Amino acid sequence: GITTPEEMIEKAKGETAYLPCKFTLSPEDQGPLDIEWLISPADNQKVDQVIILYSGDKIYDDYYPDLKGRVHFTSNDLKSGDASINVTNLQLSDIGTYQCKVKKAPGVANKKIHLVVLVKPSGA
């Protein structure tokens, strides 16, 4: 499963947000590894929008237009147990719940991060 609970990350416009998603695999989890990150924007009604994906040993991005080029996995070895990603140059539009799904049949886990972006620094 994923090593961290549902959390809230508060950043400032322009900064970069690090969305942690580390996981441990069980001996039973013998199926192929899939890592999907979805987002439910606060500004609109869309829910569970695909942001980035790791399937069949390949990375697939370019799903959520407004987030183009600003999302990348942080680790250079996902299989090792780290699905974390970075959202660079945060904008107020990036506010919403980001979800990390890590699957290895029969294994499945997910984590929800509520990202908040503030015009200028301070959560004081």
UniProtKB/Swiss-Prot annotation:
Organism domain of life: Eukaryota
PTM annotation: N-glycosylated.
Domain called Ig-like C2-type: residue spans: 1-114
Record-annotated disulphide pairs: 21-100
Distribution of this protein across tissues and organs: Expressed in pancreas, brain, heart, small intestine, testis, prostate and at a lower level in liver and lung. Isoform 5 is ubiquitously expressed. Isoform 3 is expressed in heart, lung and pancreas. In skeletal muscle, isoform 1 is found at the neuromuscular junction and isoform 2 is found in blood vessels. In cardiac muscle, isoform 1 and isoform 2 are found at intercalated disks. In heart expressed in subendothelial layers of the vessel wall but not in the luminal endothelial surface. Expression is elevated in hearts with dilated cardiomyopathy.
Glycosylation sites: 86
Subunit: Monomer. May form homodimer. Interacts with LNX, MAGI1, DLG4, PRKCABP, TJP1 and CTNNB1. Interacts with MPDZ; recruits MPDZ to intercellular contact sites. Interacts with JAML (homodimeric form). Secreted isoform 3, isoform 4 and isoform 5 can interact with the extracellular domain of the receptor.
Function of the protein: Component of the epithelial apical junction complex that may function as a homophilic cell adhesion molecule and is essential for tight junction integrity. Also involved in transepithelial migration of leukocytes through adhesive interactions with JAML a transmembrane protein of the plasma membrane of leukocytes. The interaction between both receptors also mediates the activation of gamma-delta T-cells, a subpopulation of T-cells residing in epithelia and involved in tissue homeostasis and repair.
Domain notes: The Ig-like C2-type 1 domain mediates homodimerization and interaction with JAML.
Name by which UniProt lists this protein: Coxsackievirus and adenovirus receptor
Gene name of the record: CXADR
Residues of the full protein shown: 21 to 144 of 365
